[PDB]
Amino acid sequence: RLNTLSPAEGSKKAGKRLGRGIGSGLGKTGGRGHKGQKSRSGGGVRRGFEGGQMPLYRRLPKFGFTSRKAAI
RNA sequence: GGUUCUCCCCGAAAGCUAUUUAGGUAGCGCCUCGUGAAUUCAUCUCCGGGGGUAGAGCACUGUUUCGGCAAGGGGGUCA
Secondary structure, eight states: TTTTTOOOOOOOOOOOSSSSSSSTSSSSSTSSSSSTTTSSSTOOOOTOOOOOOHHHHHHOOOOOOOGGGGGG
16 A cells, blocks of 8 residues: 555645746746846845845944843 | 747737946836735716816016106206
8 A cells, every 4th residue: 555645635736847948937047037136146245235225223323221130 | 140839818019227337137116827905996876085287367477558646857037
C-alpha cells in the first residue's frame, strides 16, 4: 500500500519557477518588471526607506523609558 | 544585456505628493486574489442646490472715437 498514500488536496502548490518559457506565465524577468533598482539582482531599499524623505521612524520623537521592575 | 515547457481566468500605469530628487525610490491613485457587508454603486426621470465659465454688457476698475454743454486758462474793452 506504500504506493497508494496521497496527501490532502491543497496541501501542495509546487512553487513558482521564474524565467521558464512564455506559456508558464511569469517568464522574462519572472514578475519583477522592466529596468529599475528593484529589478536588479540583489536590488531593493532597506527597511523604512522612503526614497530620501525623512523616514516615519525619524520624523516622530522618541518617548518614554523602560522600567526594570516590569520584567520581574 | 540575458532570463529556457504548456494551457485557462482577470488585467494596468506612464498620475499626485516627497526626495542631492528628476532614467531611482516611498505612500496614495490604477491591477490581481481572498474575506465581510448595506436597492452600496452606475445610467435615466423628477425634485433641492451653490456657481460667475461661454455669451453679453460698460454701473464699477482701465482703455477708446465723435458731438454738445462747456467751470477754468491766454489775448483784449474797460473804472
